[PDB]
Each structure stands twice: as C-alpha cells, then as structure tokens.
Paper text:
Among the various glycosyltransferases (GTs) involved in this process, PglH stands out because it is a membrane-associated enzyme that catalyzes a well-controlled, processive reaction.
The pyrophosphate moiety interacts via hydrogen bonds with R191, K196, and T271. The GalNAc unit is located in the cleft formed between the N- and C-terminal domains. The 6’ hydroxyl of GalNAc forms a hydrogen bond with the side chain of H118. The structure can explain the specificity of PglH for GalNAc over GlcNAc: whereas the axial hydroxyl group at C4 of GalNAc can be accommodated by the enzyme, an equatorial hydroxyl group (present in GlcNAc) would generate a steric clash with the main chain carbonyl oxygen of L269.
Author numbering: 1 to 360
Write the structure that this text describes.
C-alpha cells in the first residue's frame, strides 16, 4: 500500500534539520506520495526530488502593530487549513516551535502527527517555550529523538518516543573504498552563532605552532550573526582564516580536508561529525552537552576536548597534524560507523513508526 506523507517545516534552508528532511523525502518519494508544507517561500537549499510536492503558506505583513497581531492568527489558521485540506495519512513536523504549532493546529483533526526533535532538549532555553513544549508534546502521536538521553527525558511525559538516527546522504554517493589525497586543510563547518562557538576555533589556531599556521589552510564554511565580529578577531589575532560564507559544495572541502573541528556547547546529533566519516576527515569535537561520546570514542576514532577549551583544541590539532599515521588510524577506525547512518535502514524504521502510529 502507498502512503501519503506530509512533512511540515518552517523553511527549506541550509539547516541540519532541513538536510535530514530532504534526505528522508527523497528516499520516500518514489514508493510513497511525499509532500512538504513550509511556512515561508523559497527554493530548497538542498536538492529535492521532483516527485516531492512543495507548498508554502500564504505570506503576511509584520511591520505594523495591527499586522504583528492579526498575521500571527492568520498564519496559524493558514496552517490549520493546509492540514485540513491535506489528504496525508500522516503528518511529520520538524523542529520544536514548528512541532508546537502543528500540535495546536491539528486539534480536532484526525490525521496523526509525528513530531521530530533535532537538538538536545536543553537547547530550548526560555521557560515559556519549555512550558509550552511540556504541555503540548504529550498530545503528539509519536516523537522522534536523536539520542538515548533525550529519549529518557521525553518518555516521562510522552507515550511513544523512538530513537531515530539521522540518515546521511553521503552514504549513497561516496563509495566505501574511496581514496583521498588530502591537503593541509582544516575545516570548521557550521552556523556562526554563539552555541557553535567559532571563536574557540580561531583562538585555537592562534596557539598552533608557527610551523603549522604558515603551512596549513584554515577554512570556515558557513554564515550567521557573528560573521562580521569573527573577521575582526581574525585580524586582531593575526591569523589567516578564509571565510567562504555558506557553501553548496561541502563535498569538495571534505575530500581535501584532513581535520574538522566542532566547538559547540549544545548539539543534538551534529551532521558534520557524521559527514566526516565518509571522507576520512579526522574529527575533533568539544564534549558538547551530552551526546558526544555516542559519536566519538576518544583516541580511537576521533578526539574530544572540554567545552570552550581552546588550549586543548590546539594540542589535539597538533597531535594529529604532527602525526599522520595517528590521524590515519583514527579515520580508519571511524569508517566502522558509516553503516550506522545509511538511508535504507533509517527509512524503514520511519516506515515502521508510521505504521505503528497508523494502527493505533
Ligand atoms: C545545535 C543543534 O542542535 N544542531 C542540530 C541541528 O543541526 P544544525 O541546524 O545546527 O546544522 P548542522 O551543523 O548539524 O548541519 C548543517 C548542514 O549544512 C551544511 N553546510 C554548512 C555550511 C555550508 O556552507 N554549507 C553547508 O552545506 C552541512 O554540511 C550540513 O549538513 O539538527 C541536526 C540534525 O538533527 C543535528 O541534530 C544538530 O546537532
Ligand atoms: Cl546551517
Ligand atoms: Cl497599526
Ligand atoms: K550556514
Ligand atoms: Na536545523
Ligand atoms: Na554539525
């Protein structure tokens, strides 16, 4: 039997949740009828298959006080309309604020709703949103989480919670026996905000051996609020870092790069620590709040440092850059994890969850 699956997401931007949704939609869209409802107009940053149907809600004004109030109500009822008129067998929403909007908008309708979390629960800070999450999430039909820790957190007040790892689209594009001729290249890939902490990357570079700073390229791929302030820090520290902005061909960076650094305080299941597995990129990561050891076995397939510890990051960087055989050992061991994120097995566990929710 074919199922009509409608995803709901705020935008189809470059974020990691969007990357996961597009991979899921593309995998499901040939056997099943897949549609996406998004709150804002625009073309998908990630390439979406032609069978996936995309609709955007109507856009509204938010410039005057009247419109700042009336358009919030119009936006909610535009979503309720799109759900009413949808002939989906199941709704699947992405990201907490969107999950909450879908739970409220779906009140009284009968299509079941699966909500999907794409961060650690601790990432949501304001007490009012944590309250709304606490009171609305019990009314979903199922919740997908990214780690066992968030599973136990949510399971306390949500009936059906399932741990679903994210599929990586590189698992179907890069052959497992690929060889790479690496350059003296170090990457930071991610949004430039406080949580991602790119300043830790810059400070670590300034502490590297002269010998390394002059013979290595350090690349920041991504954009965000902190872009301008980071370029000043680069000047003030007297280092050479190349800001590429937001790049569409991250594959070319991964192919040439020896090392990637993640400096976040809080992550769900960081995509760059998965994508690196398929290109023999050595992973150095802060011990972001809670899931880091689920992706890196320290000194076996990668290296962990304390949060906000730019000195430790520099030493770990020097440890693999001054010892290529040790770096090669880490990335060889990391290859055993490539099978954990194949699209095929994760797609079927989503289909199992959809069937379990449709049969209740
Ligand atoms: C703070 C947080 O919880 N973030 C979570 C959120 O991911 P994020 O929203 O924080 O983004 P991410 O870092 O996990 O991935 C961003 C993605 O876009 C990429 N990219 C980046 C720069 C660029 O120039 N070009 C480009 O394509 C990239 O290679 C990638 O797949 O959702 C993910 C999937 O659930 C993970 O759970 C993340 O941990
Ligand atoms: Cl992003
Ligand atoms: Cl007004
Ligand atoms: K970005
Ligand atoms: Na995201
Ligand atoms: Na990431």
């Amino acid at each position: 039997m074919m199922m009509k699956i409608s995803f709901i997401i705020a935008t189809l931007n470059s974020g990691g949740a969007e990357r996961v949704l597009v991979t899921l939609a593309n995998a499901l869209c040939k056997e099943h009828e897949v549609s996406i409802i998004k709150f804002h107009t625009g073309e998908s940053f990630y390439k979406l298959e032609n069978e996936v149907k995309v609709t955007s809600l109507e856009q509204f004004r938010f410039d005057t006080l009247y419109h700042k109030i009336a358009s919030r109500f119009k936006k909610f009822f535009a979503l309720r309309k799109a759900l009413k008129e949808s002939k989906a067998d199941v709704f699947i929403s992405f990201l907490d604020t969107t999950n909450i909007a879908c739970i409220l908008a779906n009140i009284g309708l009968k299509t079941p709703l699966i909500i999907s979390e794409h961060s650690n629960e601790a990432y949501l800070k304001p007490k009012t949103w944590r309250f709304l999450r606490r009171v609305s999430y019990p009314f979903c039909d199922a919740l997908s989480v990214l780690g066992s820790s968030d599973k136990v957190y949510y399971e306390r007040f949500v009936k059906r919670v399932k741990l679903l790892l994210n599929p990586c689209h590189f698992s179907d594009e890069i052959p497992f026996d690929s060889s790479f001729e690496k350059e003296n290249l170090v990457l930071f890939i991610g949004r430039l905000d406080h949580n991602k902490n790119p300043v830790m990357f810059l400070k670590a570079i300034a502490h590297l051996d002269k010998n390394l700073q002059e013979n290595y390229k350090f690349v920041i791929a991504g954009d965000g609020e902190l872009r301008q302030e980071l370029e000043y820090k680069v000047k003030s520290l007297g280092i050479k870092v190349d800001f590429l902005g937001r790049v569409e061909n991250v594959k070319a960076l991964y192919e040439k790069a020896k090392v990637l650094c993640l400096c976040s305080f809080v992550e769900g299941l960081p995509t760059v620590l998965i994508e690196s597995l398929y290109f023999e990129v050595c992973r150095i990561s802060s011990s972001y709040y809670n899931g880091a050891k689920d992706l890196i076995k320290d000194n076996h397939d990668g290296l962990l440092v304390g949060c906000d510890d730019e000195i430790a990051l520099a030493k770990k960087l020097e440890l693999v850059l001054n010892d290529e055989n040790f770096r090669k050992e880490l990335v060889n061991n990391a290859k055993q994890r490539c099978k954990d994120f194949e699209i095929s097995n994760i797609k079927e566990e989503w289909l199992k969850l959809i069937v379990e929710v449709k049969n209740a």
